[PDB]
């Protein structure tokens, strides 16, 4: 994986040695070159993963996440290049350096063969997001957003690391190419129960699980939108990678223990859909929708069937793209009106038609319109959860009503109706904004034609 | 009730301004200033090219794949004759007629 | 009770509004013109027979009985005019009521497509922006202490001076754009 | 259509249940009874691709109607005689069906007269 | 822009059911001050409207004539 | 899009047809069953005592 | 040309719409009468309905008891 | 005589059938006059801040931001855990979880005891 | 559909509706003729006129504006403002 | 959910708020039959099953009776034809619920034609009266719009099931299969009452919209001479006159026809249609008297959409939003 | 916006109640808060809990699509009480009578449907007759097993 | 083309088109128009592309894997040979999945091509599909999303002990 890490660490001086007016152009161009270069990871076989070296490997699972990450960096760079025009040049380079370091830690996270390495850089990712959230926000509560985001996640994983070290004393190696053959069944005891809890709770917090989701809306209604997109789209996927790398070792005790987690996830996804039905802020509504989607992903990986794994990976990637572009929509609205209220700016279809079209496409892809990959993943998870038990479909069915009901309503009061009379600073569409929106939207439609590249490690 | 002279005079002036603006909403004859720049073309482009393309695709790319265009066999009635074999289905027994 | 100018509805106004609503419901009840005319004349004769009653409390109680029978004998679906609220075409054409300041956002390559209109628009805007200080001078001395007591806007008291706060009430576009 | 009132408001014993009938022996009072006849042999009846709902006992008129429809294109209205013959055969089958209903009803009513005679003397 | 309006004396309430309505108010001692407003709907081509059976059998004469002509044509055709 | 459209036989999926297209062609010509309930050889396993 | 609107009077009627409407009504009634004379079956009946009470016992094969 | 239209949560009394309109006490018109004065002050302020040619921006209503701050940020600081709040939280927080847990649990034991004994029909179920 | 109307068209219409009213004599009416002062009708006759105009133009006038316009010229002004004449 | 039956009906009358051709296509002829098309698509599974057949037959009869009852006394023309097409959807699920697939498919093919043509005729009438859609202001349009008069009369006759029309080739077969089978007697009774109610509301549309004395304002802008509207109504009139006969001729025989039945079970459709016509003629003649009848609970229950958009569209959103906010969000 | 513009805690005395009433710019007596039952409402004014369709539609509102003015202390549930949501319009019929009529109608004809299920209608006919042992082979049965030969007899 | 054993289809029997009435049908005329206007240029461009194909004709080969010792002869916790055993097991898993896919294709083709009487003439395809479905359910079902050759071998062992217990308890 040295053919992508070295470009990132070599682009680091490029954003440090660039001129006073060509930082954005050079960084965007070279990040797009890295994004094209990243397509070589798809040399996948039906039996063996592409094991690059001793400490780097990438199966069919992590490759779409890597492609999403280093396609996501230029979108973040375009989405965060407006409000930082008055910011000092050294701090502009600091922000771009923070984004570059976050990408580097993310790509090193998904390809770490050893689980200790994966943990170490999986919360080396914690420093840049905390710095960006606390420094480049726009409200007072960002200070509180630096606490609840941090002291949740670490409190889930400082047990977990100990458990990982215990496996290093039990199996003798935490390598994932070894542990697929050296894995032993887990007996039923209180010690194995607490080992399962310690190995589960960190990524349960990082999804987030319902009850532990309080850090997600408080860290999204105030972030700079580069931070909002990286948090919603790719930073929540570390929990999914933790599931699909850890659940091999936790069999068969997971089957008769994950009942309250599934109950909490299902009823909390119902609750968060209902909370989306009665929200006043765009950012909080999108964050609670993300909570519902990650609760669905939690159920999908907890029932551990192959169809569920396909649906979980597809839903993860599709939800990441959709939530990132929804946050782009909300950022455009907050840029134009300087507020986050939903009822303030209404009837923008009368003034902005192309943003209305992007709103319509975002809302259609949010409620899993076929044949998009969101519908593919959601349908596969629906069938897998029906295979787990029958009555679950009832607990799905209401949600599939509610996940439509707000998804259009959040559109309608922002786009349809009589426009607000005392608002007159609604500028037309900047080409940068619509270029970013199309760069978000076109891959999401394109992946529907060829879904087999994002269908998990067992397609 | 009626109109106070203050409010009546106010609405009179407002109606004067409204009539003025709606008079000025008309456009002069020269606007808009546009910048400067077959009978059977529909039945050939929109029909015949799709027929040729879809027939090429169906003949040399879909029929080569097995079990793609699966067609129901035609019904066989007494007194018919198969062209590809020549064997005749033998005649059906006489009807025990009632009418 | 809720009015732009008044704070209390006089009993005469309430009687007139009852007459209007009850006769509209009567027209919505019997469709044909002859029956509507006959029953409208009957209702007008009833209100005329109870017109000569100068007692405030007696007209108060008669109004209360009248409202009670009117709500007791009203049609479930009264006829509503197509432009009235609750009608079939209420705020239907409002999707084309684009305000004028969107013409501020036009590209200069299209602002030369209609030169006379845009010149007229800029001179109208100049007229408005020089009249703004005059009209706020008009309100700043005519308004009573502690803000206005009623929402009725004053007229223009001087020749040549524009009406005060004239812009956003006169600027609303045509109902068929 | 008085059988519904004779069954529900009256007595349900007189009208037999159409779900399970006839339950009486078929040779009861019918010596040398001859069964119905099928004209089309099963292979020649099956190769015409005829649906199972229409696989009646006299489908020769039906298959001749299908042949007439299949070889008279485009003059679709040239095979009403075969349709009339098929309608006649289906009508005759329906006469057989209400004859079976009347036979069952009269036989069971004869059983009622029999048990009434048992009540009279036995 | 400018349309001509008809004479306002040619709108009379006589010959209409509004005349019977005014008869009813004259029987009960009232006046019908809005009969002239609705008088125009009850005269001219707007009046004399056919009934339901007359609405159903519109054009029955031509249809029956064509039917008897066609049945005579087929009667001669079969011969 | 051009790269992922002409990607060389992802996970040998098309290959998974072709060998299978051979395999049944073997066992439909020799009377063998299509697939067996035993994934491995049932004679090469030491069954534990009961 | 376009019909100018008329104030509280009968609107102008072009001969074309009246001719086409009478034509369609004529073909409607002609088709109804022709189909009723030719077929005369689905509106009135196709086959006679035999009564259940006119059957004898030797058709039903009931021995007397 | 006449049906008494009862008040309801989903069917309020009309503005015309309410006796409160038709009382002739003096504080009624005094309150209506002071409400009209408040509304006139607010409307005058909105029209002066809204018809300005110089202003290009959102008229910042304090009521909107006040309501959005009172909806979320002002729930915990004025919350005191008493019998009613704790009872409602325990009723709506752990009740449905326990109900769904028990329903899905007994469904799981029924399905498992059906499938180990071979009674569950799994003839064609090969995709899971 | 729905041709625009000039001020003289609605003026002809309003004088036509006034002339078709039995209480109005067809000679003494004008644009500025007050209903209570020039002609001396009642409030009920004013609401009758308002209903006649509402039914004639096919749209609803609010009750406050129904009672505020007190001359035929005020009716013409309100109708011409609501339909936005002279475009 | 798709054909707007009982439980989930009121979106079909609610969806008349859009443009007239949008209604005339989607919620009159094409999109609403997708659920019925799915039902007749899966006929080999519903053939051998009795529970689903019984419950879907009862749901269809419930839907057609309630929607016809609501259509009896409504005052909006587009709402009337919306309830008409929902009653037709209930009738089509009734006849697929009695194991007769191709009759229901033929009814779909005929119903698209004639219901679409009624919708565009009503839309032409609406546009000619300046966007006014109340049946209590139209009428006297027999000689005003003779082309749409003829088309609307033919369409109402075809909707009622008059002999040798396009509705005759499907609805009469449907009702003769419904009479002579092992059905529920209550479902058959509500099918006949629904047929009578279709006759009643169709002749109500004819009487209140095409006959009588005019009720619209005096600005007469009557015009229908545009060639597009004339050509379209002529095309669908030719379709609703002869395409039903063509389709009923050219469909292959895939079901056993039933034609041996008594006379009182064969004259049923025409007699019930004529009885409904006579009863609504009595109502229309009695409405002309200069009297006043105080409405009972029947008119309130009928004109207010069975109170279903007044009770189920007020309590369930209140409960859902109070559960979402007071119990969950707060 | 400052520390006394955002809503604060519950006002107890008349003086702080008047300060809160002039904070929302309404009447002092008409400003009355929710009871302090521990649900964290605060000093927000309690509206009389009516919908927004009941507002005057002809009045020149500041926001016409919402019928809401500027500076008004709005409802605690403005999002719930929009025109596009739950409506509290005064119905011409009683609500309890509406519920009773709907429940009685639905229950009555559901009971009648089940009664008709108990006692169905039919035709005076016999069973349908099918040849070849009621089409044993055409039903999908195996040919290696010979069925019981059942014949259908004429009458 | 394709092999005719793996996708078997019965020979076609098309009856003779003989007109009964004197009215001609447009199907023959439109078939002639299709053969003239459409089929001829399609065949011309097809002979063009195949003639350009004939100049450069190189071959590609089907990859074949030799048989490797399976999971039964693997020493425990010695990854260097159970890796190969798992590799072979995954390849056989994909092959068996495609085998059930091709049997499903056969069943669907039979049911479509047999018309309205498919319930009797596709008995052989139904028996083959049921046998292959039972084989797949015994071989691979209920393994979980983390399937491995050890889990499949343990499931096979448990099934063998169940069968031996059923034999011994009913001997
Ligand atoms: C987000 C906040 C909550 C986080 C919750 C995280 C999960 C909860 C449980 C975590 C326990 C700590 C890690 C244990 C890892 C054990 C691995 C293992 O193999 O154990 C077997 C060993 C078994 O002992 P052994 O292996 O030494 O013995 C040899 C084996 N036998 C038993 C056969 C002789 O388990 C233990 O030793 C004890 C495990 C339980 C530990 C209980 C104390 C900690 C309680 C939870 C505290 C969580 C943080 C709270 C504060 C958060 C911040 C405010
Ligand atoms: C991937 C994970 C991270 C996500 C973010 C990724 C960021 C980087 C993105 C890089 C670029 C995009 C890469 C993915 C591209 C996917 C698309 C692709 O190439 O697919 C290959 C596939 C390849 O097809 P195939 O797989 O069938 O081909 C087999 C391969 N060969 C040819 C070698 C045998 O392309 C297509 O399927 C194209 C089909 C033809 C084109 C479309 C024709 C129809 C168009 C619509 C007509 C109207 C229909 C009706 C509409 C009604 C209204 C809605
Ligand atoms: C005997 O009369 C049985 C007839 C069939 C069952 C009853 C059907 C009743 C409804 C249809 C006929 C209505 C006659 C007025």
Kindly report the three-state secondary structure assignment for every residue of I26-54.
CCCCCCCCCCCCCCCCCHHHHHHHHHHHH
Residue in this structure with the two tokens 């290049």, named with its chain if needed = A81
DSSP single-letter state for residue G6: E
For residues D17 and D2, give the distance between their C-alpha atoms in angstroms, rounded to a whole number: 15
What is the C-alpha separation between J248 and K11, in angstroms, rounded?
A: 79
Structure tokens that stand for J105 in this block: 């498919």
C-alpha A330/C-alpha A348 separation (Å) is: 13
User: Whole-angstrom Cα distance, residue J262 to residue A266?
Assistant: 60
Which of helix, strand or coil describes residue L100?
Answer: helix
Which of J202, J203, J196 has the alpha carbon at shortest distance from J273?
J196
Cβ(A431) – ligand 1 distance below 6 Å: no
Cα angle value J11/K91/J132 (rounded, 5°): 55
CB F45 within 8 A of CB L160: yes
K45 to chain H, closest Cα gap in Å = 10
Ligand 3 geometric centre to CA of H10 (Å): 45
According to DSSP, the residues that pair with D35 across neighbouring strands are K153
Contacts of A345 in chain C (CB under 8 A): none
Q: Three-class SS of residue B93?
A: coil
CA-to-CA distance for I14 and I31, rounded, in angstroms?
A: 9
Nearest residue to A261 (alpha-carbon basis) of H106, J325, H88, H104? H104
Question: What 8-state DSSP symbol labels residue K68?
Answer: B
The whole-angstrom separation of Cα D86 and Cα J257 is: 10
Is residue L108 helix, strand or coil?
helix
- The dihedral sign for the CA sequence A16, A21, A24, A30: negative
Q: Any chain L CB within 8 A of the CB of K138?
A: yes
Pocket test for ligand 2, best of A315, A449, A457 (most atoms within 8 A of CB): A449
DSSP letter, residue C175: S
Angle between helices C11-29 and C56-72 (to 10 degrees): 20
Picking from I11, I13, I21, I22 by the largest number of E CB atoms within 10 A of its own CB, the best residue to mutate is I22
Rounded Cα distance between C15 and F19, Å, is: 92
How far is Cα G33 from Cα E69, in angstroms, rounded to an integer?
12
Which two structure tokens, joined as six digits, stand for A52? 């690059």
Within 8 A by CB and 6+ apart from A428, the residues are: A352, C105
Task: State residue B64 phi and psi, 5-degree precision.
Answer: -70, -25
Long-range contacts of L35-40, Cβ-Cβ distance < 8 Å, separation of 24 or more: L37/B48, L38/B48, L38/B51, L38/B52, L38/B55, L39/B55
A57's enclosing H/E stretch is strand A57-58
Rounded Cα gap, residues L34 and L29, in angstroms: 9
Q: Find out whether A181 and L79 touch, Cβ atoms under 8 Å.
A: yes
Q: Test A390 with H107 for CB contact under 8 angstroms.
A: yes
The two tokens of residue K75 are 């409802």
Distance CA L66, CA L72 (A): 17
User: What distance in Å separates the CA atoms of residue J119 and residue J121, rounded to the nearest whole number?
Assistant: 5
Could you give phi then psi for residue L163, rounded to 5 degrees? -65, -40
- Answer whether J145's CB lies under 8 Å from J125's CB: yes
**How far, in Å, CA of I46 to CA of A191, rounded?**
91
Structure tokens at K51: 């919908």
Q: State the Cα–Cα distance between residues H124 and L135, nearest whole angstrom.
A: 11
- Asked if L99 and L132 count as a contact pair (C-beta separation under 8 A), the reply is yes
Nearest CA to CA, how far is L20 from chain D (Å)? Answer: 5
Got the DSSP string for D20-71? S---S-TTTT-TTPPBP---S-HHHHHTT---GGG--TTTHHHHHHHHHHHH
Closest alpha carbon to A203 in A255, A271, A166, A258: A258
Which residues, other chains included, contact L141 with Cβ-Cβ below 8 Å and sequence gap of 6+? Answer: H125, H126, H128
CA distance A252 to C5: 76
Q: For residue C167, report the phi and psi dihedrals to the nearest 5 degrees.
A: -75, -65
Provide the token pair at K66.
């919402």
Phi/psi of residue B88, each to 5°?
-100, 130
Question: What is the sign of the dihedral through the CA atoms of C111, C116, C117 and C120?
Answer: positive
Whole-number Å distance, alpha carbon J270 to ligand 3 midpoint, is 15
Tell which residue, J120, J88, J106, J93, has the closest CA to residue J243: J106
The β-bridge partners of H97 are none
Residue ranges with strand state E in chain J: 219-220
Please, what's the b/e burial string for A270-284 (b: 16 or more CB within 10 A of its CB; e: otherwise)?
bbbbbbbbbbbbbbb
* Rounded Cα gap, residues D81 and D67, in angstroms: 13
Neighbours of B54 (CB within 10 A): 13
> What is chain A's length?
459
Burial of E11 (0-12, 13-18, 19+ CB in 10 A): buried
Closest to L115 in 3D by CA, of D51, A446, J264: D51
First to last CA, chain D: 36
Q: What is the DSSP letter of J226?
A: -
User: Under a CB-based contact definition with an 8 Å cutoff, are residues I58 and J217 in contact?
Assistant: yes
Burial class for G52, CB neighbours closer than 10 Å (0-12, 13-18, 19+): middle
8 Å CB contact between A423 and C168: no
* Cis peptide bond upstream of A252, omega within 30: yes
CA distance A388 to H104: 10
Confirm whether I42 is a catalytic residue: yes
Contacts of K65 (CB under 8 A, 6+ apart): A346, A347, A417, A418, C91
Which residues in J have their CB inside 8 Å of a CB on H?
314-315, 318, 327-328, 330
**Contact present, K56 and K67 (Cβ < 8 Å):** yes
Please give the Cα distance from A289 to A232 (Å, whole number): 10
Q: Which residue among G7, G17, G31 places its CB closest to the CB of J146?
A: G17
3-state DSSP call for residue B37?
Answer: coil
Catalytic residue among I42, I55, I63, I65: I42
Helix or strand holding residue H87 (H, E): helix H83-93
Rounded to the nearest angstrom, the distance between the alpha carbon of J9 and the centre of ligand 3 is: 30
Tokens of A400: 């599939």
- DSSP conformation class of A84: T
Nearest chain C alpha carbon to B10 = C155
Task: Give the determination technique.
Answer: cryo-EM
Strand segments (E) across chain L: none
Closest CA to F22 of L98, L124, A46, L69: L98
Identify the residue among J18, J319, J324 best suited for mutation to test binding to A, counting A beta carbons within 10 A and taking the highest.
Answer: J324
The secondary structure of residue A419, as a DSSP letter, is P
DSSP state, residue J281:
H
Query: Ligand 3 centre and the CA of J21: distance in Å?
Result: 41
Q: What is the sign of the dihedral through the CA atoms of I26, I27, I33 and I34?
A: negative
* The two structure tokens encoding residue A210: 């319902």
User: What ligand has the least distance to the C-alpha of J185?
Assistant: 3
CA distance B55 to B65: 15
Residue A272, by phi and psi: left (phi above 0), alpha (psi -120 to 50) or beta? Answer: alpha
Residue L73 DSSP SS3: helix
Query: Distance between CA E76 and CA F2 in Å, rounded?
Result: 74
SS3 B70: coil
| Helical residues (DSSP H) of L13-39, grouped into ranges | 26-34
- What's the resolution in A? 3.8
Measure the CA–CA gap between J298 and L35, rounded to whole angstroms: 68
CA–CA gap between residue A161 and residue C121 (Å, rounded): 70
Place of tokens 């022709």: G34
Q: Is the CB of A200 under 6 A from ligand 1?
A: no
Q: Are A377 and A311 in contact (CB under 8 A)?
A: yes
C16/I67 CB distance under 8 A: yes
Query: Would you tell me how many other CB atoms lie within 10 Å of the CB of residue A355?
Result: 23
Strand pairing report for A57-58 and A50-51: antiparallel
3-state secondary structure (DSSP) of residue A345 = coil
Q: What is the dihedral of CA H69, H75, H78, H84, to 10 degrees?
A: 150
Alpha-carbon gap, residue A60 to A55, rounded angstroms: 17
Inter-residue contact A84 to A226 (CB < 8 Å): no
Angle at C162 between CA C161 and CA C168, to 5 degrees: 160
Rounded to whole angstroms, the Cα distance separating L70 from L87 reads 10
User: What are residue B87's phi and psi, to 5 degrees?
Assistant: -70, 135
DSSP string, A116-136: HHHHHHHTTTHHHHHHHHHHS
Residue nearest to atom 53 of ligand 1 (CA): A155
Token code pair at residue A421: 């009379």
Phi-psi region of C146 (alpha: psi -120 to 50; beta: other; left: phi over 0): left
Give me A51's structure tokens: 């094991």
D15-21, long-range: CB < 8 A, 24+ apart:
D15/D105, D16/D101, D16/D104, D16/D105, D16/D108, D18/J182, D18/K122, D18/K123, D18/K125, D18/K126, D18/K127, D21/D104, D21/K126, D21/K127
Q: Where are the alpha helices (DSSP H) in A38-125?
A: 62-79, 89-110, 115-122
First vs last C-alpha separation in chain J: 33
Residues 6+ apart with CB under 8 A from C50: C59, C62
Q: Which of B15, C173, K25, K69 is nearest to A422 (CA)?
A: K69
Touching pair H, E by Cβ (3+ pairs < 8 Å): no
Contact criterion met (CB below 8 Å) for A447 and A373 = yes
Q: Are strands J219-220 and G6-7 parallel, antiparallel or unpaired?
A: antiparallel
Residue A159 CB partners (closer than 8 Å, separation 6+)? A197, A198, A201, A202
- Asked if omega into D22 is within 30° of 0 (cis), the reply is yes
Considering only CA atoms, which of H44, F22, B28 is closest in space to residue C151? H44
Whole-angstrom distance, CA of residue K120 vs CA of residue A157: 68
Beta bridge partners of B81: B88
How many interchain CB pairs under 8 A, G with K?
4
Is the distance from the beta carbon of residue A191 to the nearest atom of ligand 1 less than 6 Å? yes
Q: Which residue has the tokens 């009626």?
A: B2
The two structure tokens encoding residue K73: 């202390």
Q: Is the dihedral of CA J148, J150, J154, J157 positive or negative?
A: positive
Decide if A163 contacts A199 (C-beta within 8 A): yes
CA of A371 to the centre of ligand 2 (A): 12
Half-sphere exposure of residue J240: CA atoms within 13 angstroms, side-chain side: 30
A45, A50, A314, G30, J263 from A457: Cα distances, Å: 10, 12, 11, 72, 70
A83, two tokens: 């409000």
Q: How far is C92 from chain H (nearest CA, A)?
A: 26
Q: Do F38 and L156 touch, CB atoms closer than 8 A? A: yes
Task: Sort residue K40 into left (φ over 0), alpha (ψ -120 to 50) or beta.
Answer: left
């Amino acid at each position: 994986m040295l053919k992508y890490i070295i470009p990132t660490m070599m682009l680091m001086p490029l954003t440090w040695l660039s001129k006073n007016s060509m930082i954005w152009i050079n960084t965007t161009l070279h990040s797009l070159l890295i994004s094209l270069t990243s397509l070589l990871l798809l040399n996948q076989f039906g039996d063996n993963s592409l094991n690059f070296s001793l400490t780097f490997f990438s199966d069919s699972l992590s490759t779409p996440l890597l492609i999403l990450t280093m396609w996501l960096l230029p979108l973040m760079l375009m989405a965060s290049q407006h409000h930082l025009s008055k910011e000092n040049l050294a701090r502009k380079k600091l922000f771009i350096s923070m984004l570059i370091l976050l990408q580097l830690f993310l790509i090193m996270t998904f390809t770490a063969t050893e689980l200790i390495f994966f943990y170490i850089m999986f919360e080396a990712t914690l420093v840049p997001t905390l710095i960006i959230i606390t420094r480049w926000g726009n409200q007072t509560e960002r200070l509180n957003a630096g606490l609840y985001f941090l002291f949740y996640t670490l409190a889930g994983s400082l047990p977990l690391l100990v458990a990982l070290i215990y496996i290093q004393n039990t199996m003798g190696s935490l390598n994932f190419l070894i542990l697929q053959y050296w894995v032993q069944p887990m007996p039923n005891s209180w010690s194995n129960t607490f080992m399962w809890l310690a190995c589960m709770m960190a990524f349960m917090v990082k999804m987030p699980l319902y009850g532990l989701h309080l850090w997600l809306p408080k860290a999204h209604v105030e972030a700079p939108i580069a931070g909002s997109m990286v948090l919603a789209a790719i930073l929540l996927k570390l929990g999914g990678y933790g599931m699909m790398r850890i659940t091999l070792l936790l069999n068969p005790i997971t089957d008769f223990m994950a009942y309250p987690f599934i109950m909490l996830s299902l009823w909390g996804m119902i609750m968060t859909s209902s909370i989306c039905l009665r929200q006043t802020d765009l950012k909080s509504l999108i964050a609670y929708s993300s909570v519902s989607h990650m609760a669905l992903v939690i159920v999908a990986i907890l029932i551990q069937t192959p169809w569920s794994y396909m649906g979980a990976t597809a839903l993860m990637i599709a939800h990441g793209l959709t939530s990132s572009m929804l946050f782009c929509l909300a950022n455009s609205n907050y840029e134009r009106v300087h507020s986050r209220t939903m009822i303030l700016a209404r009837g923008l279809q009368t003034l902005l038609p192309l943003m209305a079209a992007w709103w319509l496409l975002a809302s259609l892809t949010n409620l899993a319109l076929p044949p998009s990959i969101n519908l593919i993943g959601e349908l596969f998870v629906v069938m897998s959860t029906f295979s787990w038990s029958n009555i679950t479909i009832i607990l799905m069915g209401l949600n599939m009503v509610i996940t439509a009901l707000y998804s259009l309503y959040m559109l309608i009061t922002t786009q349809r109706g009589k426009h607000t009379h005392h608002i007159n600073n609604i500028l037309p569409s900047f080409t940068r904004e619509n270029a970013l929106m199309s760069l978000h939207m076109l891959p999401l439609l394109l992946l529907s034609l060829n879904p087999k590249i994002i269908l998990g490690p067992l397609y | 009730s009626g109109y106070t002279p203050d409010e009546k005079l106010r609405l009179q002036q407002l109606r004067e301004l409204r009539r003025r603006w709606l008079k000025d909403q008309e456009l002069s004859p020269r606007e808009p200033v546009l910048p400067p720049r077959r009978h059977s073309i529909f039945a050939f482009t929109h029909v015949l090219i799709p027929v040729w393309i879809i027939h090429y695709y169906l003949k040399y790319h879909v029929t080569t794949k097995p079990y793609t265009i699966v067609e129901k066999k035609p019904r066989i009635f007494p007194g018919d004759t198969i062209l590809e074999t020549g064997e005749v289905i033998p005649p059906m027994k006489e009807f025990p007629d009632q009418h | 009770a809720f009015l732009p100018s008044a704070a209390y509805l006089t009993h005469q106004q309430k009687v007139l509004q009852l007459y209007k609503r009850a006769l509209r419901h009567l027209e919505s009840r019997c469709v044909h013109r002859d029956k509507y005319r006959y029953f409208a004349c009957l209702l007008r004769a009833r209100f005329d027979e109870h017109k000569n009653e100068k007692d405030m409390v007696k007209a108060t109680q008669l109004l209360r009985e009248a409202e009670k029978e009117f709500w007791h004998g009203q049609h479930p679906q009264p006829y509503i005019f197509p432009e009235s609220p609750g009608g079939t075409s209420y705020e239907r054409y409002e999707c084309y009521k684009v305000p004028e300041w969107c013409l501020d956002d036009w590209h200069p390559s299209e602002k030369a497509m209609y030169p006379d209109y845009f010149a007229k628009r800029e001179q109208w805007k100049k007229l408005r922006r020089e009249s703004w200080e005059r009209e706020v001078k008009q309100l700043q001395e005519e308004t009573p202490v502690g803000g206005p007591r009623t929402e009725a806007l004053p007229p223009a008291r001087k020749q040549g001076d524009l009406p005060p706060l004239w812009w956003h009430i006169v600027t609303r576009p045509r109902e068929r754009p | 259509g008085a059988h519904l009132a004779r069954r529900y408001l009256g007595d349900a014993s007189v009208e037999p249940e159409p779900l399970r009938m006839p339950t009486f022996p078929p040779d009861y009072g019918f010596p040398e009874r001859k069964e119905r006849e099928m004209v089309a042999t099963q292979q020649e009846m099956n190769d015409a691709q005829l649906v199972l709902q229409q696989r009646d006992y006299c489908a020769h008129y039906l298959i001749r109607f299908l042949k007439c429809k299949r070889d008279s294109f485009p003059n679709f209205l040239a095979c009403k005689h075969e349709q009339h013959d098929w309608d006649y055969c289906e009508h005759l089958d329906y006469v057989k069906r209400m004859k079976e209903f009347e036979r069952e009803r009269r036989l069971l009513q004869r059983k009622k007269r029999r048990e009434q005679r048992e009540a009279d003397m036995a | 822009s400018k349309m001509e309006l008809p004479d306002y004396k040619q709108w009379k309430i006589e010959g209409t059911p509004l005349e019977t309505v005014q008869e009813k108010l004259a029987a009960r001692g009232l006046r019908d001050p809005w009969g002239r407003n609705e008088a125009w709907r009850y005269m001219g081509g707007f009046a004399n409207n056919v009934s339901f059976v007359g609405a159903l059998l519109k054009g029955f004469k031509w249809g029956f004539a064509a039917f008897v002509v066609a049945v005579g044509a087929e009667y001669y055709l079969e011969s | 899009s051009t790269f992922v459209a002409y990607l060389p036989d992802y996970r040998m999926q098309e290959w998974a047809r072709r060998e299978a297209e051979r395999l049944v062609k073997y066992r439909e010509a020799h009377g063998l069953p299509l697939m067996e309930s035993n994934c491995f050889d049932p004679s090469k396993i030491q069954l534990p005592e009961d | 040309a376009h019909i100018e609107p008329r104030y509280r009077q009968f609107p102008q009627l072009t001969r074309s719409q009246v001719i086409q409407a009478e034509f369609f009504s004529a073909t409607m009634w002609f088709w109804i009468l022709w189909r009723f004379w030719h077929d005369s079956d689905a509106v009135l009946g196709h086959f006679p309905y035999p009564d259940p009470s006119q059957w004898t016992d030797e058709e039903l094969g009931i021995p007397p008891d | 005589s006449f049906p008494k239209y009862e008040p309801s949560r989903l069917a309020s009394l009309p503005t015309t059938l309410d006796p409160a309109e038709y009382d002739i006490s003096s504080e009624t018109r005094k309150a209506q006059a002071e409400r009209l004065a408040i509304r006139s002050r607010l409307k005058r302020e909105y029209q002066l801040q809204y018809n300005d040619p110089s202003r290009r921006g959102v008229v910042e209503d304090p009521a909107l931001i006040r309501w959005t701050c009172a909806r979320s940020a002002n729930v915990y600081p004025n919350f005191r855990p008493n019998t009613k709040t704790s009872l409602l939280g325990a009723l709506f927080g752990i009740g449905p979880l326990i109900f769904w847990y028990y329903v899905f649990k007994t469904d799981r034991d029924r399905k498992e005891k059906l499938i180990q004994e071979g009674k569950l029909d799994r003839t064609f179920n090969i995709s899971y | 559909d729905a041709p625009p109307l000039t001020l003289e068209g609605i003026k002809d219409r309003v004088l036509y509706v006034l002339k078709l009213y039995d209480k109005i004599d067809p000679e003494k009416l004008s644009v500025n003729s007050h209903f209570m002062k020039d002609l001396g009708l009642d409030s009920l006759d004013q609401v009758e006129i308002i209903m006649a105009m509402e039914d004639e133009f096919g749209f609803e006038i609010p009750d406050i504006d129904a009672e505020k316009l007190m001359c035929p010229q005020e009716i013409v002004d309100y109708i011409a403002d609501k339909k936005d004449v002279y475009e | 959910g798709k054909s707007a039956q009982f439980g989930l009906h009121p979106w079909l009358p609610s969806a008349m708020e859009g443009p007239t051709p949008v209604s005339a296509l989607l919620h009159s002829s094409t999109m609403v039959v997708a659920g019925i098309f799915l039902l007749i698509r899966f006929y080999p599974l519903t053939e051998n099953n009795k529970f689903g057949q019984s419950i879907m037959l009862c749901l269809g009869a419930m839907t057609t009776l309630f929607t016809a009852m609501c259509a009896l006394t409504q005052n909006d023309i587009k709402k009337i034809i919306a309830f008409s097409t929902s009653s037709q959807l209930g009738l089509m699920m009734v006849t697929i619920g009695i194991n007769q697939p191709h009759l229901a498919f033929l009814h779909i093919c005929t119903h698209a034609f004639f219901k679409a043509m009624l919708f565009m005729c009503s839309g032409s009438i609406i546009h000619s009266l300046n966007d006014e859609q109340d049946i209590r202001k139209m009428g006297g349009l027999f000689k005003a719009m003779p082309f749409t008069t003829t088309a609307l009369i033919i369409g109402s006759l075809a909707l009622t099931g008059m002999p040798f029309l396009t509705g005759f080739y499907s609805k009469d077969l449907i009702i003769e299969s419904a009479n002579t089978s092992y059905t529920n007697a209550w479902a058959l009774l509500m099918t006949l009452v629904a047929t009578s109610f279709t006759a009643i509301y169709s002749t109500r549309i004819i009487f209140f919209a095409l006959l009588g004395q005019p009720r619209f304002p005096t600005l007469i802008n009557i015009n229908e001479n545009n060639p597009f509207l004339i050509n379209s109504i002529k095309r669908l009139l030719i379709g609703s006159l002869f395409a039903g006969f063509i389709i009923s001729n050219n469909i292959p025989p895939m079901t056993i026809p039933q034609m041996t039945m008594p006379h009182y079970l064969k004259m049923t459709a025409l007699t019930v249609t004529i009885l409904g016509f006579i009863l609504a003629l009595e109502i229309s003649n009695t409405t002309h008297y200069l009297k006043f009848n105080y409405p009972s609970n029947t008119f309130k229950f009928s004109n207010l959409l069975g109170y279903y958009p007044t009770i189920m569209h007020r309590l369930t959103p209140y409960m859902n939003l109070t559960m979402s906010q007071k119990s969950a969000s707060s | 916006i400052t520390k006394d513009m955002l809503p604060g805690p519950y006002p107890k005395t008349p003086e702080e109640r008047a300060a809160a009433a002039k904070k929302y710019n309404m009447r002092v007596e008409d400003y009355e808060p929710y009871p302090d039952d521990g649900m964290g409402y605060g000093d927000y004014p309690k509206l009389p809990d009516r919908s927004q369709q009941e507002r005057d539609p002809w009045y020149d509102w500041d926001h016409p699509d919402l019928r809401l003015n500027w500076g008004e202390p709005m409802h605690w549930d403005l999002d719930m009480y929009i025109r596009n949501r739950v409506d509290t319009s005064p119905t011409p019929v009683n609500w309890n009578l509406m519920c009773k009529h709907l429940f009685g109608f639905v229950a009555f004809m559901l009971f009648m449907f089940w009664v008709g299920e108990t006692y169905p209608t039919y035709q005076p006919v016999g069973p349908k007759q099918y040849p070849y042992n009621n089409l044993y082979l055409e039903r999908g049965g195996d040919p290696n097993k010979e069925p019981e030969p059942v014949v259908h007899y004429e009458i | 083309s394709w092999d005719k054993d793996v996708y078997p289809e019965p020979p076609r029997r098309t009856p003779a088109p003989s007109p009964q009435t004197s009215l001609p049908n447009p199907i023959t005329y439109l078939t002639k128009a299709f053969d003239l206007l459409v089929d001829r240029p399609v065949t011309l461009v097809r002979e063009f592309i195949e003639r350009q194909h004939a100049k450069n004709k190189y071959y590609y080969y089907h990859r074949e894997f030799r048989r490797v010792p399976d999971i039964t002869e693997c020493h425990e916790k010695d990854v260097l040979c159970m890796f190969e055993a798992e590799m072979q097991w995954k390849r056989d898993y994909k092959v068996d999945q495609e085998i059930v896919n091709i049997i499903q294709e056969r069943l669907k083709a039979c049911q479509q091509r047999e018309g309205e009487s498919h319930r009797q003439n596709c008995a052989k395809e139904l028996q083959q599909f049921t046998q292959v479905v039972k084989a797949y359910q015994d071989r691979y079902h209920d393994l979980g999303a983390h399937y491995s050759a050890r889990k499949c071998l343990a499931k096979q062992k448990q099934r063998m002990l169940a069968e031996r217990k059923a034999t011994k308890e009913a001997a």
